[PDB]
Enzyme design. Structure first.
Site, PDB file in Angstrom:
ATOM      1  N   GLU F  58      10.062  -4.655  13.056  1.00  0.00           N
ATOM      2  CA  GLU F  58       8.853  -4.107  13.664  1.00  0.00           C
ATOM      3  C   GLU F  58       7.590  -4.657  12.989  1.00  0.00           C
ATOM      4  OE1 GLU F  58       6.700  -0.628  12.667  1.00  0.00           O
ATOM      5  OE2 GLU F  58       7.534   0.488  14.364  1.00  0.00           O
ATOM      6  N   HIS F  59       7.685  -4.961  11.692  1.00  0.00           N
ATOM      7  CA  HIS F  59       6.550  -5.495  10.933  1.00  0.00           C
ATOM      8  C   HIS F  59       6.239  -6.953  11.247  1.00  0.00           C
ATOM      9  CE1 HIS F  59       5.550  -2.738   7.283  1.00  0.00           C
ATOM     10  NE2 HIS F  59       5.898  -2.003   8.325  1.00  0.00           N
ATOM     11  N   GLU F 135       4.175   1.282   1.930  1.00  0.00           N
ATOM     12  CA  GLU F 135       4.199   2.308   2.953  1.00  0.00           C
ATOM     13  C   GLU F 135       5.217   3.391   2.620  1.00  0.00           C
ATOM     14  OE1 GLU F 135       4.744   0.288   6.746  1.00  0.00           O
ATOM     15  OE2 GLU F 135       2.600  -0.200   6.639  1.00  0.00           O
TER      16      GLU F 135
END
Ligand code: HEM
Ligand code: HEM
Lengths: 101, 422, 55, 49, 49, 442, 220, 52, 54
Positions: F58-59, F135
């Site tokens: 996703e990154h 994160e």
């Protein structure tokens, strides 16, 4: 005619709380509605009531009363709490009725 | 069955405006926009506007504090109050069948409050809480001090009631504030999802406090101050602005575009904005985490423009200076004819998307119906936006570099510069 | 801890919080004297009863 | 665009006391878009822009 | 970080019916409870006697 | 009128490409719109050693494709005023774009280029490695999330659902260019994807563009097979993470839910509507219709609480979560479990009538804008194998009555062994046994 | 000292020279009494220019001498009194630091008469920066100061505080006659110029109370 | 006069409220209250807190 | 008080000494005698009364 008025003023005098300098409303038993009503009183009315009561309790302990001159007069008894109390009860009934149906 | 309707927009004798639509949405959304905010407060009644916001659920002459909540919840409806420094909006939402029901309360809340002393009294300590959550975002703390340093009055007033005034506001101040500001000529009754004839019948046939423009806001006066809050935070927030443009100002569209040209908030999740000169410019100067954007606010008789940054305490200097050069470099023809074209659409897109939300739409139809008197065509807005020249943009950039700046910082400022070191 | 051992002690705190620092209305009359008499009476009946029960 | 926002059922609340960002990712989009709005709902959380 | 935390293995203590990490533990629920509640109900009956 | 407006809503056109991919859309008069691909893939699909791939991916999904490197890709998206965002859950991932109806076709091309040709440049991977690790430390300070992960971690201990979406520290530190590639290849496939679009777009024109950039067709029969995952076992248990140095406590308690397909989910949501939610800034205060909210206000039981009906393909979690001061945890829990028992035993027709109205308003609110309508379509097809309109939902909702709610809640709540997650200064909340007893007798 | 005291010599950390900013901090807090201070960079400790402000101080009024009396030798006070009509107070503010100093005035007044009080306090500083200093005002102040200094050393605390402040910042004890000699050697010009340094220099201000009528540093 | 004061057993204490925090009505009960010079601060192990 | 086990002047007692009373998680069987002693006592009294009556 003035029958109800004569009776009322009669009882008022027979009751005798005015001899302690108490107002009719100062004599209400503090149930829940009255408890709430009092919380809504303006600071000044609240403190005046407080002194009147503490004053009666001191007379009561002394087994004395106020000098006839100082007795609250039937037509000068300010029903300061009744307006609030009637509202507190008005709200409670609304909630009560609304929570049923 | 149903199709395309038309955005009607009457106005009564007392000056009360009534904008309406009808997209046959299953749910309706009605609002009451008002020209009133913390801008009309004085050293004497500060915070009163804030408390008035929180007091929306208090008893009214027609409905009790109790029936307002149980009544609105009963029909799956909602009721909220959003307000800026100069506008207040009371809006409700519900299914089409219950608009009428939910309407009664909206009417009562905005026109017939009672502000009973005890209710008001029990409520005040809430300002303390409501403020405490909002101030969790440093974002809000600096914008309070920014406006403070930027002005001497009206707009200089905080949006959240000051601490010293918590518990000192009176029912009188509330009443007077509502009498002198919630006047028909300053109010508009917008409403998406209902026939214009009904929303109209409600207004006229119901509203009271009216006719006139009561209290008037003492024109905002620029100060150009510099407020700094040393608080230990590892992340320094900073804002540097200059008097920008007012609402409807011809110079408005210019900054809006200069905004997008400099970078007005990311478009790719976790991406490094390239169309953002300011961001790109900063990244070249710093190496650690950060953020930087174009800041733009349009008020009735004034405006604010500049940039806002966030950075590790030590790399605060490099980040703000870098953010500056990027504003000077633009005030020096550093704006390609294309950057202006990107921004132009980048803006029409942003504006456009921002109106898919019933809230966004009503907020649009309302803001105009109140500050103007009619609804601009979505093609006019777009036409007015691209009619901005490469010069308009560059000059706006100059107005910033030339004008007197006001700044607001927050965090460990041991390496943050003073407005006179830029 | 508490300064005076009448407030802290789990037992003297009891004798205290019901017979010494107990808040009473300033104006209760002699008709409020019967509760204690009833109590004393009870302790008395028990004592004389035990003495009699032993014979 | 006279929208104070267009220039600048649901909802989640929070809580504080009275009386973290560590990368360009969890910070971007947090630089005051424009003016600051404030909301309060009788049934939903408080918000601010 | 909490992501590095996982619940230990309770195989040594699990009842049979819920020993398989891929079988709905709901099918044997009324069973595992009916037994333990039967024991209790019985103790009650004995005590009542 | 309500009844009719529900009908006038433009139907959702759905057509499948012979390669397995499905294309659906809801056309409006809007000039702007949203389109994206909703994939049936997440952490539940990962294993012990590759936990987090879907996230690490996703990154990179935005750091450009091979057809066009980073700077190009970004520049091309930004310069056309389109917004590119996405996410990855446990059983669902999605990448969608917001732009003007015009760009619809170029958008699709980009969507397809990302889900198919992600560059996965290796210099980028060593960068996201630090980004992700950060994160994790930031999200580690969000008690609400730390708590739902712990809820899952124990509720489904020993299974796939027990894993976090962000994965483990070790995995992020050692995942390979290979693994990520492998993840994309193994999971991002046509039959497991849905192209959803909402706004002013022509289904025809949309499906056309699809065929064009969503090409690659399958030969074997296995390439058209959508694997059914191994069921996750629910466990009545608890995890208590104690730290008295934290300001307030977080508590989450739940029982096993049915899973998307089951019609009972409608009732359950109506139930949750009765108990509702609350937070200290709700102006309604002591008058809120939610009994739990009211007590909460009267006795200052918590800073906030919320009910949830988290559904999955074959399972789910039905519970509630609250934040409260260390010294009020017990009473809150007590009143909360109380309200649950009230659900199984004494729900009134008055409470449901309102719950339904709240639920209707709630479902309509989930369709406010193109992005949320697109999210609904993406998920509906992926979970219900089709779209369920507001007109149908409403019908289902109107069918619910007191009698029904009691029976459904009794079915999933009464005398069940819940899963409990508690984080913070939790000393006042105690003993699973006591919590367990709270599961019976109104 | 010898036989005990350790912690080795030197000067370890050094203070980063003070840098003048000239800011304006305002604190709106509702108080009915507004306090305000307006200063400019002034003399440094033991500075040559020092004694000048000390005198300009007493020339303007540096704290009452008669219980409940209206200072006459106080131009600033008298000047204010002519402008306002309600209760108040106003004085010459002076601070001498190692590498810098502060000078100006400090006021207190009812919130509404805040404007008139501070503007009035200003004119009295300008009017002095314009030869408005009699050769006598300088003489009064001169003794007014030698007296103040002198009395302030009857207290064992005051004395030790004197003998100490010098023995540390200097290295020896000045003669009480030198101080007096250095003080009167101040010219009527030294004083007037000090006043100018204030009117010309960049000012920094600090308010407090209900400031709804209090002026901003740029309105002076 | 390098005294920080000469340019800028006894003693009475006081008390306030914390958490948030925590009269002069004539020119008489205010005069002499306008910052003589710098600000000093004292603390004693045996007496009240001082401030100038 | 929400639950009538915490507020009631009597049920608060039964509660604060036999239901919510905090006990060490590891007391052995040698901690079982206090209750037995108690029960024993109520038992002796009951059988004693029954005998005293004859
Ligand atoms: C609430 C306290 C008590 C009351 C009201 C009470 C009352 C009485 C009465 C009315 C009698 C009959 C008196 C008579 O001869 O006319 C009596 C007798 C007796 N009571 Fe009690 N009693 C009390 C407590 C006790 C106790 C605690 C004991 C034993 C420890 C006790 C032992 C006796 C005995 C031995 C007699 C029989 C001898 C006699 O008649 O005087 N009593 N009691
Ligand atoms: C702390 C509790 C008590 C203890 C330790 C206790 C112990 C005893 C003992 C050792 C005896 C002799 C038993 C035998 O060898 O025959 C006895 C007898 C007796 N006790 Fe108790 N007792 C208790 C309480 C009571 C009470 C409360 C009563 C009266 C209400 C009572 C009434 C009697 C009577 C009537 C006898 C004589 C008949 C017999 O010997 O069985 N006892 N008790």
């Amino acid at each position: 005619g003035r029958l109800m008025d004569r009776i009322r003023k009669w009882y008022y005098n027979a009751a005798g709380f005015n001899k302690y300098g108490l107002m009719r409303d100062d004599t209400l038993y503090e149930d829940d509605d009255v408890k709430e009503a009092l919380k809504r009183l303006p600071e000044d009315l609240y403190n005046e009531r407080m002194f009147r009561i503490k004053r009666a309790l001191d007379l009561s302990l002394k087994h004395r009363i106020l000098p006839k001159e100082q007795w609250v007069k039937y037509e000068e008894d300010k029903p300061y709490l009744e307006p609030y109390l009637k509202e507190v009860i008005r709200e409670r009934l609304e909630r009560e009725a609304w929570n049923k149906k | 069955c149903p199709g395309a309707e038309d955005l009607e927009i009457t106005k009564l004798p007392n000056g009360l405006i009534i904008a309406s639509l009808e997209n046959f949405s299953p749910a309706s959304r009605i609002g009451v926009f008002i020209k009133a905010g913390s801008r009309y407060e004085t050293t004497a009644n500060l915070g009163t506007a804030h408390l008035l916001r929180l007091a929306s659920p208090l008893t009214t002459k027609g409905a009790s504090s109790f029936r307002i909540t149980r009544g609105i919840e009963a029909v799956g409806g909602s009721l909220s109050v959003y307000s800026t420094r100069e506008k207040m909006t009371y809006c409700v939402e519900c299914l089409r069948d219950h608009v009428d029901t939910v309407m009664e309360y909206l009417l009562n809340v905005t026109t017939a409050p009672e502000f009973r002393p005890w209710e008001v009294t029990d409520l005040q300590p809430q300002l303390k809480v409501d403020k405490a959550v909002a101030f969790q975002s440093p974002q809000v703390g600096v914008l309070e001090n920014l406006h403070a340093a930027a002005y001497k009055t009206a707009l200089a007033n905080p949006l959240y009631c000051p601490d010293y005034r918590i518990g000192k506001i009176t029912s009188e101040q509330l009443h007077h504030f509502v009498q002198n500001n919630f006047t028909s000529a300053r109010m508009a009754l917008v409403g998406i999802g209902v026939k214009h004839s009904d929303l109209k019948q409600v207004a006229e046939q119901f509203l009271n406090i009216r006719s006139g423009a009561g209290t008037s806001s003492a024109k905002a006066t620029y100060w150009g101050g510099e407020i700094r809050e040393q608080n230990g935070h590892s992340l320094v927030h900073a804002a540097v602005v200059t008097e920008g443009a007012a609402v409807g100002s011809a110079e408005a569209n210019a900054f809006s575009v200069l905004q997008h040209v400099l970078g007005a908030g990311p478009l790719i999740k976790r991406g490094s904005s390239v169309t953002s000169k300011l961001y790109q410019g900063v990244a070249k100067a710093t190496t650690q985490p950060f953020d930087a954007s174009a800041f733009n606010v349009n008020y009735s008789d004034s405006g604010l423009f500049g940039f806002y940054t966030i950075s590790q305490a030590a790399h605060a200097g490099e980040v703000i200076r870098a953010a500056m050069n990027q504003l000077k470099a633009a005030a020096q023809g550093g704006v390609t004819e294309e950057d202006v074209t990107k921004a132009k659409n980048q803006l029409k897109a942003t504006y456009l998307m921002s109106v898919e939300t019933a809230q966004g739409l009503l907020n649009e139809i309302g803001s105009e119906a109140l500050l103007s008197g009619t609804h601009t065509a979505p093609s006019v807005v777009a036409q007015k936006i691209d009619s901005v020249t490469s010069a308009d943009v560059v000059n706006a950039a100059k107005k910033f570099v030339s004008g007197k700046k006001s700044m607001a910082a927050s965090g460990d400022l041991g390496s943050t510069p003073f407005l006179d070191e830029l | 801890m508490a300064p005076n051992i009448r407030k802290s002690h789990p037992l003297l705190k009891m004798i205290n919080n019901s017979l010494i620092d107990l808040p009473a209305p300033s104006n209760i009359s002699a008709w409020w004297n019967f509760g204690s008499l009833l109590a004393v009476c009870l302790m008395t009946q028990i004592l004389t009863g035990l003495l009699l029960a032993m014979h | 665009m006279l929208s104070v926002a267009a220039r600048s059922x649901x909802x989640x609340x929070x809580x504080x006391x009275x009386x973290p960002l560590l990368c360009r990712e969890s910070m971007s989009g947090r630089s005051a878009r424009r003016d600051l709005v404030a909301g309060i709902s009788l049934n939903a959380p408080a918000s601010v822009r | 970080v909490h992501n590095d935390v996982t619940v230990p293995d309770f195989s040594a203590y699990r009842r049979e019916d819920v020993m398989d990490a891929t079988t709905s533990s709901q099918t044997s629920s009324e069973d595992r409870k009916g037994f333990s509640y039967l024991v209790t109900a019985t103790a009650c009956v004995a005590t009542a006697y | 009128t309500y009844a009719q407006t529900l009908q006038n809503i433009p139907e959702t056109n759905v057509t499948t490409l012979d390669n397995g991919l499905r294309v659906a859309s809801e056309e409006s008069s809007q000039p702007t719109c949203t389109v994206g691909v909703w994939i049936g893939a997440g952490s539940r699909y990962e294993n012990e050693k590759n936990n987090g791939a879907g996230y690490f991916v996703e990154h990179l999904a935005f750091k450009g494709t091979k057809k066009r490197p980073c700077a190009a890709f970004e520049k091309e998206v930004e310069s056309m005023g389109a917004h590119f965002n996405g996410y990855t859950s446990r059983e669902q991932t999605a990448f969608y774009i917001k732009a003007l109806s015009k760009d619809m076709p170029k958008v699709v091309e980009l969507l397809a280029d990302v889900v198919q040709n992600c560059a996965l440049e290796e210099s980028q991977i060593e960068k996201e490695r630090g980004v992700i690790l950060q994160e994790l430390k930031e999200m580690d300070n969000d008690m609400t999330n730390v708590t739902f992960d712990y809820l899952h971690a124990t509720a489904f201990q020993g299974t796939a659902l027990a894993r976090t979406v962000e994965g483990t520290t070790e995995n992020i530190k050692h995942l390979t260019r290979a693994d990520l590639a492998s993840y994309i290849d193994t999971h991002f496939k046509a039959p497991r994807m849905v192209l959803a679009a909402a706004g002013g777009i022509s289904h025809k024109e949309l499906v056309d563009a699809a065929r064009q950039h969503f090409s690659g067709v399958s030969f074997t029969y296995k390439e058209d097979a959508v694997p059914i995952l191994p069921r996750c076992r629910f466990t009545g248990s608890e995890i208590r993470a104690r730290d008295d140095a934290l300001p307030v406590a977080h508590v989450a308690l739940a029982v096993e839910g049915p899973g998307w397909a089951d019609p009972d989910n409608v009732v359950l949501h109506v139930a949750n509507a009765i108990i509702g939610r609350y937070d200290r800034t709700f102006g309604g205060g002591k008058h809120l219709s939610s009994r739990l909210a009211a007590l909460a206000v009267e006795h200052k039981l918590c800073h906030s609480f919320q009910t949830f009906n988290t559904s999955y393909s074959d399972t789910g979690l039905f519970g509630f979560h609250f934040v409260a001061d260390p010294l009020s945890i017990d009473d809150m829990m007590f009143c909360a479990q109380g309200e649950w028992m009230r659900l199984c035993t004494s729900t009134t027709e008055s409470e449901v009538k309102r719950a339904k109205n709240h639920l209707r308003s709630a479902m309509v609110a989930q369709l406010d804008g193109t992005t949320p309508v697109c999210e609904t379509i993406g998920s509906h097809l992926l979970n219900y194998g089709r779209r369920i309109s507001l007109e149908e939902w409403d019908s289902r909702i109107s069918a619910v009555d007191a009698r029904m709610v009691r029976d459904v809640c009794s079915k999933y709540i009464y005398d069940k062994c819940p899963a409990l997650a508690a984080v913070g200064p939790i000393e006042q909340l105690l003993d699973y046994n006591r919590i367990r007893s709270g599961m019976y007798w109104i």
